[PDB]
Design a protein around this motif. Structure first.
Motif, PDB file in Angstrom:
ATOM      1  N   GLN A  14       0.820  -1.202   0.000  1.00  0.00           N
ATOM      2  CA  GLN A  14       0.000   0.000   0.000  1.00  0.00           C
ATOM      3  C   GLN A  14       0.858   1.258   0.000  1.00  0.00           C
ATOM      4  N   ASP A  15       1.951   1.258   0.769  1.00  0.00           N
ATOM      5  CA  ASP A  15       2.839   2.416   0.799  1.00  0.00           C
ATOM      6  C   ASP A  15       3.570   2.577  -0.532  1.00  0.00           C
ATOM      7  N   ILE A  16       3.974   1.454  -1.139  1.00  0.00           N
ATOM      8  CA  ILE A  16       4.584   1.470  -2.468  1.00  0.00           C
ATOM      9  C   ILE A  16       3.614   2.028  -3.504  1.00  0.00           C
ATOM     10  N   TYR A  17       2.340   1.624  -3.437  1.00  0.00           N
ATOM     11  CA  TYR A  17       1.357   2.131  -4.389  1.00  0.00           C
ATOM     12  C   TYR A  17       1.062   3.606  -4.164  1.00  0.00           C
ATOM     13  N   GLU A  18       1.077   4.063  -2.912  1.00  0.00           N
ATOM     14  CA  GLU A  18       0.831   5.478  -2.659  1.00  0.00           C
ATOM     15  C   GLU A  18       1.989   6.339  -3.150  1.00  0.00           C
ATOM     16  N   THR A  19       3.227   5.869  -2.973  1.00  0.00           N
ATOM     17  CA  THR A  19       4.373   6.577  -3.544  1.00  0.00           C
ATOM     18  C   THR A  19       4.339   6.552  -5.070  1.00  0.00           C
ATOM     19  N   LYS A  20       3.935   5.422  -5.656  1.00  0.00           N
ATOM     20  CA  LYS A  20       3.869   5.338  -7.110  1.00  0.00           C
ATOM     21  C   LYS A  20       2.715   6.155  -7.680  1.00  0.00           C
TER      22      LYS A  20
ATOM     23  N   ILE B  15       3.304  -2.347  10.917  1.00  0.00           N
ATOM     24  CA  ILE B  15       1.884  -2.390  10.590  1.00  0.00           C
ATOM     25  C   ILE B  15       1.236  -1.040  10.885  1.00  0.00           C
ATOM     26  N   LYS B  16       0.895  -0.309   9.828  1.00  0.00           N
ATOM     27  CA  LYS B  16       0.162   0.940   9.959  1.00  0.00           C
ATOM     28  C   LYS B  16      -1.338   0.649   9.963  1.00  0.00           C
ATOM     29  N   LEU B  17      -2.149   1.701   9.955  1.00  0.00           N
ATOM     30  CA  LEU B  17      -3.589   1.518  10.099  1.00  0.00           C
ATOM     31  C   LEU B  17      -4.386   2.047   8.920  1.00  0.00           C
ATOM     32  N   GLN B  18      -4.089   3.257   8.442  1.00  0.00           N
ATOM     33  CA  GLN B  18      -4.786   3.781   7.271  1.00  0.00           C
ATOM     34  C   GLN B  18      -4.210   3.239   5.973  1.00  0.00           C
ATOM     35  N   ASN B  19      -3.018   2.644   6.021  1.00  0.00           N
ATOM     36  CA  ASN B  19      -2.451   1.912   4.896  1.00  0.00           C
ATOM     37  C   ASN B  19      -2.802   0.432   4.954  1.00  0.00           C
ATOM     38  N   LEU B  20      -3.855   0.091   5.694  1.00  0.00           N
ATOM     39  CA  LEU B  20      -4.306  -1.288   5.831  1.00  0.00           C
ATOM     40  C   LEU B  20      -5.811  -1.466   5.664  1.00  0.00           C
ATOM     41  N   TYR B  21      -6.630  -0.433   5.882  1.00  0.00           N
ATOM     42  CA  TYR B  21      -8.042  -0.522   5.520  1.00  0.00           C
ATOM     43  C   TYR B  21      -8.265  -0.164   4.058  1.00  0.00           C
ATOM     44  N   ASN B  22      -7.570   0.860   3.566  1.00  0.00           N
ATOM     45  CA  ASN B  22      -7.617   1.217   2.152  1.00  0.00           C
ATOM     46  C   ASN B  22      -6.836   0.156   1.393  1.00  0.00           C
TER      47      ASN B  22
END
Lengths: 50, 15
Positions: free
Chosen positions: A39-45, B1-8
């Motif tokens: 998810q962090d990789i996709y947000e940066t991309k 483990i984050k939280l808003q990067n885990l529901y979205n």
């Protein structure tokens, strides 16, 4: 999308009470780490793609 | 483990 992920959420939220009878918590948390990392990789991309 | 990067989460962003 979330139909097999909210089940994992509830499964970890129920298995916070025993916490030692279930050894499979660690692989599930590793997949949570994988989901957060992807998810962090996709947000940066998506920040670079715009 | 984050939280808003885990529901979205979709399967459109796993790749």
């Amino acid at each position: 999308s979330a139909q097999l992920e909210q089940l994992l959420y509830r499964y970890r939220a129920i298995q916070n009470h025993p916490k030692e009878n279930k050894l499979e918590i660690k692989a599930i948390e590793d997949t949570f780490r994988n989901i957060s990392r992807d998810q962090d990789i996709y947000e940066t991309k998506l920040d670079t793609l715009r | 483990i984050k939280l808003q990067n885990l529901y979205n989460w979709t399967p459109s962003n796993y790749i």
